[PDB]
């Protein structure tokens, strides 16, 4: 990651604790497919 936009965040967008949703049950025993 480069361009100084994927390696830095502003204050307000880095402290947003609550995010709405419309993994949460990861077991660490599952191979994650990539392609």
């Amino acid at each position: 990651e480069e361009t100084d936009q994927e390696v830095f965040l502003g204050p307000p967008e880095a402290q947003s604790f609550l995010s709405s949703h419309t993994l949460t049950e990861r077991f660490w025993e599952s191979y994650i497919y990539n392609g």
């Binding site: 990651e1 100084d4 994927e6 390696v7 830095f8 965040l9 502003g10 204050p11 307000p12 880095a14 402290q15 947003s16 604790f17 609550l18 709405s20 949703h21 419309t22 949460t24 049950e25 990861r26 077991f27 660490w28 025993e29 599952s30 191979y31 497919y33 990539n34 392609g35």
Partner: protein
């Protein structure tokens, strides 16, 4: 003759002295079952190398020139360049083929073993139990004489064609499988497995549909999913050994493994376990199976004659045991003792200890803890100017297991320390703030957010001083919280938080999240709004309406941890949904013949369905069209016959294999004949990625 001798296969007097023990562990036995297991293990690892080990993805994981943070077990180890890594995986494939066909067995076993562990130790984020098991089996099979029956090496050497093998070859494998089952069972005697919390949502799969005819969903998720697993683990440990219980054990174990294969994405673990299950049968089952065939098949299948004498066994007449027999007996005893001890060796390596025990992979604690992360904040302070900034949570990383282990956090901090000077930051101080909950508890911090991880102290054999304890006293609250989870509308959402004394949480509610409220469940907290610098102390059962679009802070000011909750709804999504419903109602009214009046021009694109020769649609129209298209696509996906799905699956796997092979060939050519011009490389790489069709 003695019943104990018949059941256990050996007499007590055989263990009176060391020499008798060596003779017992080196007695003759048939080689057939070992050969079949060798073949199946080799075939499965051959299929597994291009899929899970990462040969297809190796061109985007160890890419040259990319700056990434690695997580190796030892800091000395570093990846080689890409081409040499492809060569290493080629050697792995050749070793697996050699093990499958039994051609140059020891060399093939070594060529599979050494690269596999090199790759395994190079990254701790790719560790899982089914990989450690494969490594251990490859380590074991290097010493066993598994090429004596149904092997190419037999055809090339008469002395090793249908010959005897020592008994400890079977004993080590049987002990390994028994240890796996039994340790998995005993590890699952935890409060979060016997009470129904781990894997609480796996009872909704359609494979459990028949059980619902006689049991409710709540009971089906406890008696069958949880207790059944524990009982099957222990019993499958014990049942297969004895002759009386082998049939029922095989049936239950096979059903268990097939269901695990369908439910999860573990990979080849279930098939390897299925192949290992027959190993408890009599050592001569393939021979009698070959006998029970027509003569035409016998002309192609392996030999059916009795095995010949070998040189790696002690024969009773007597024969004085040599050196290899004693080494085999010692290896068996010491290896089994080490396998018993290692899963419980977490009191020595306390640096790797956390809320759970040790690094994942070598404990057999499968599907016993589930984690849900809420937020990850990484702060940095520059050592020259004093500026304070925030980094992206997962920059310069490929896996997300660094949020739960201290050592990986230390390695990530050092990597960031060496890499940030490229982006105009001097010697920094980096702080981490990570929230995580295990098995649906209150979300609490895992590392102290006031400690510079770059200068923190960590050694493997001492306890880490900056890992917050797991507050297990709030475990029963998971009952009440669930009730609160079921009292909400279809729009409202709830997040539960438990915070330590002294610390504070600073939060920025987004402008979209209107109607956000904070309620206190236990303890004493103070909520501060910085817009006017006003702080209020909240007592038990008090609720406050937070501002939307500003900063607020919550401080804990009690001798004990404080538990509270955020209840919020998204106003923007609600308004958009109302407008979308109104637009759909207007469309339906137009369609059914009502609303005879002319449609507005903004509605005309909706009926037309295509933006051609007109003004660009408003965001609402674009959103409606996108939602309709997505719903239609999902509906089309659902109405797909089985054969098409199977064909697509096969084509995708063929694509993976073809890409792996072509990339490996390109890498080997680059190593041997040198690197051609960039245009030729681009053409070859483009040809490699092409879909089969």
């Amino acid at each position: 003759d003695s019943r104990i001798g018949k059941l256990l296969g050996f007499e007590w007097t055989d263990l009176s002295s060391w020499r008798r023990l060596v003779t017992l562990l080196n007695r003759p036995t048939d080689p057939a079952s070992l050969a079949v297991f060798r073949f199946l293990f080799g075939f499965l690892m051959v299929l597994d190398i291009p899929q899970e080990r990462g040969l297809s993805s190796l061109d985007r994981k160890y890419l040259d020139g990319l700056d990434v943070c690695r997580f190796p077990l030892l800091d000395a180890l570093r990846p080689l360049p890409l081409d040499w890594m492809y060569l290493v995986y080629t050697i792995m494939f050749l070793g697996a083929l050699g093990m499958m066909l039994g051609l140059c067995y020891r060399i093939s076993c070594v060529l599979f073993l050494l690269p596999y562990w090199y790759v395994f130790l190079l990254d701790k984020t790719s560790w899982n139990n089914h990989s450690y098991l494969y490594g251990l089996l490859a380590f074991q099979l290097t010493f066993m004489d598994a090429n004596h029956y149904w092997s190419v090496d037999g055809l090339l050497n008469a002395h090793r064609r249908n010959a005897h093998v020592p008994l400890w070859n079977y004993a080590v494998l049987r002990g390994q499988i028994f240890i796996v089952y039994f340790i998995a069972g005993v590890k699952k005697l935890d409060a979060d497995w016997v009470e129904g919390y781990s894997m609480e949502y796996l009872s909704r799969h359609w494979l459990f549909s028949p059980f619902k005819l006689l049991l409710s969903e709540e009971l089906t998720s406890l008696l069958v999913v949880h207790w059944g697993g524990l009982l099957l683990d222990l019993s499958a440990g014990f049942l297969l050994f004895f002759d009386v219980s082998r049939s029922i054990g095989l049936f239950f174990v096979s059903y268990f493994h097939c269901m695990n294969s369908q439910l999860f994405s573990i990979g080849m673990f279930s098939y390897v376990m299925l192949a290992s299950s027959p190993l408890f049968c009599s050592p001569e089952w393939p021979r009698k199976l070959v006998s029970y065939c027509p003569r035409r098949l016998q002309q192609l299948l392996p030999l059916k004659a009795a095995p010949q004498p070998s040189v790696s066994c002690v024969y009773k007449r007597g024969q004085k045991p040599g050196l290899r027999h004693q080494l085999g007996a010692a290896f068996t005893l010491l290896y089994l003792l080490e396998q018993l001890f290692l899963p419980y060796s977490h009191f020595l390596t306390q640096g790797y200890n956390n809320w759970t025990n040790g690094l994942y992979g070598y404990s057999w604690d499968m599907m016993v803890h589930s984690r849900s992360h809420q937020h990850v904040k990484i702060t940095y302070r520059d050592g020259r100017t004093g500026e304070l900034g925030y980094l992206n949570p997962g920059v310069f990383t490929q896996s997300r297991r660094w949020k739960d282990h201290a050592d990986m956090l230390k390695q990530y901090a050092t990597c960031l320390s060496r890499l940030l000077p490229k982006y105009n930051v001097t010697e920094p101080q980096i702080y981490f703030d990570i929230w995580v909950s295990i098995n649906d508890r209150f979300q609490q911090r895992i590392f102290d957010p006031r400690v510079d991880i770059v200068q923190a102290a960590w050694s493997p054999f001492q306890r880490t001083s900056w890992v917050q304890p797991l507050l297990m006293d709030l475990s029963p609250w998971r009952a009440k919280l669930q009730e609160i989870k079921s009292s909400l509308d279809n729009h409202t959402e709830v997040v539960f938080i438990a915070d330590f004394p002294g610390l504070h949480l600073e939060n920025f509610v987004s402008e979209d999240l209107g109607n956000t409220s904070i309620q206190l469940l236990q303890g004493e907290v103070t909520v501060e709004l910085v817009a006017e610098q006003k702080n209020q102390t909240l007592r038990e059962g008090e609720k406050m309406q937070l501002p939307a679009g500003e900063y607020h802070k919550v401080y804990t000011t009690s001798p004990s941890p404080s538990c509270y909750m955020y209840v919020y709804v998204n106003t923007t999504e609600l308004a958009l949904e109302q407008d979308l419903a109104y637009l759909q109602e207007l469309k339906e009214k137009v369609e059914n013949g009502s609303e005879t009046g002319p449609l507005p021009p903004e509605l005309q694109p909706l009926l037309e369905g295509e933006v051609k020769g007109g003004p660009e649609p408003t965001p609402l129209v674009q959103t409606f069209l996108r939602r309709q298209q997505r719903l239609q696509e999902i509906e089309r996906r659902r109405n797909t016959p089985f054969h098409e799905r199977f064909f697509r699956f096969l084509l995708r796997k063929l694509y993976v294999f073809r890409r792996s092979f072509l990339m490996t060939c390109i890498s080997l050519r680059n190593l041997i004949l040198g690197r051609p011009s960039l245009e030729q490389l681009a053409q070859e790489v483009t040809y490699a990625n092409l879909r089969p069709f």
